[PDB]
Amino acid sequence: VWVVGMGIVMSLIVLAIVFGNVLVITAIAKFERLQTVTNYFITSLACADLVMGLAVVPFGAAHILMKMWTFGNFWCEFWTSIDVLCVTASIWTLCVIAVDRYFAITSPFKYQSLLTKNKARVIILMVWIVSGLTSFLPIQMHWYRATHQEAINCYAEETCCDFFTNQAYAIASSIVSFYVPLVIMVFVYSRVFQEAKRQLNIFEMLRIDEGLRLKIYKDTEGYYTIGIGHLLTKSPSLNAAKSELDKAIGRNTNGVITKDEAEKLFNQDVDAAVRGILRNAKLKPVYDSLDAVRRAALINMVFQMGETGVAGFTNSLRMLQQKRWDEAAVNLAKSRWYNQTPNRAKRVITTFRTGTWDAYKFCLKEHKALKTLGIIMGTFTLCWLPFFIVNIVHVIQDNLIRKEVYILLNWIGYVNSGFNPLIYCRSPDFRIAFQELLCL
């Protein structure tokens, strides 16, 4: 009665992995904006998950429901070699993304991989070539085979596939395959998050707060706006809005501008917002008393409301000068500014309180992409690390958790092959790709 119910759970686990990882590979193989260096490595781990969901998870489920091996000692040594290669290739791929992301975030390109799509393929090929050698050669050469009679009675028998390891293999293949890339991946991807938050500037802070639209839209207050919070005019005539745009750009825009055109406007509004402070005798001494992070928070207020508007905060600016952040915070929040834009004022005042980009944490579109790659890496660890800890622990002492726990923790690790396609649903580029393939 247990077996029937157990099989149906595993049958759905298999299909969830296969159809999930098919949809991921299918999207990158067809969609143009999805063909990127970082999404090429994502194809390498979705591949490992599909090979896992087709050649590993189905054979593993059978070995449990029938409690025996009905596929011979050849497919037993090949099945385990594929499994080990999938697990080794997945973390090394994640550690490669982690490293690639460190080099992309430190480089002046900030969110662009330095490797070309030709180098990226070689990196994936060298991952699958080398990880296939550390997985298939110590298994087909039988460097994994243990010396105890209980293990050799399972090595001679065709109805057994309990992967028995000697004390040496069990420690080496756990260290090189999982522990070494995990230590590097986490240490290096703690730095990709660290470098993104520290290199956050006023231009990203305002792209977060004012957004980006390349066509004239109505502001929060109700005046014609374009690009990144660039007020075209307060006039309620579209002809009076499309006139100011054609003059500010210097071409027949017809109510639409480019990313380059909008960026040129935004670099001019930010420079004027800084200028507007240095010319205003009220804001200028407060601009001196504020640090690099809090200076961007004042520029953020002057950019939105204006040099005159912000000078109106006579009590706040004073408490900001005296380094009394929290005393300024309460006064800045009991403002009509806070009530008009609560979401943005919550972020501006927190940056004033903390003096850190703690308010703009994973807010930029490029940063939610780092959080996504950060969840895939972290979730992997949540699934595989309990199996590996118990794996490396039972090399020291054999007799504690035995077979019943080892298989469960292995299946926590197996279920991780089907979770990555559900975490790609966070990315709008994949969200749009998935709904197109599934016809929704």
Ligand SMILES: CC(C)CCC[C@@H](C)[C@H]1CC[C@H]2[C@@H]3CC=C4C[C@@H](O)CC[C@]4(C)[C@H]3CC[C@]12C
């Ligand atoms: C079952 C075992 C022995 C077979 C291993 C499967 C091999 C053929 C697959 C799985 C992962 C695959 C890679 C996944 C990622 C990419 C990105 C793609 O845009 C170009 C090809 C490339 C670089 C693939 C090459 C072939 C590859 C290495």
Ligand SMILES: CC(C)NC[C@H](O)COc1cccc2[nH]c3ccccc3c12
């Ligand atoms: C049912 C068996 C075949 N599957 C166990 C793990 O999924 C594979 O885990 C590993 C991945 C990479 C290297 C490894 N070395 C090991 C030594 C003992 C057990 C698992 C592993 C292992």
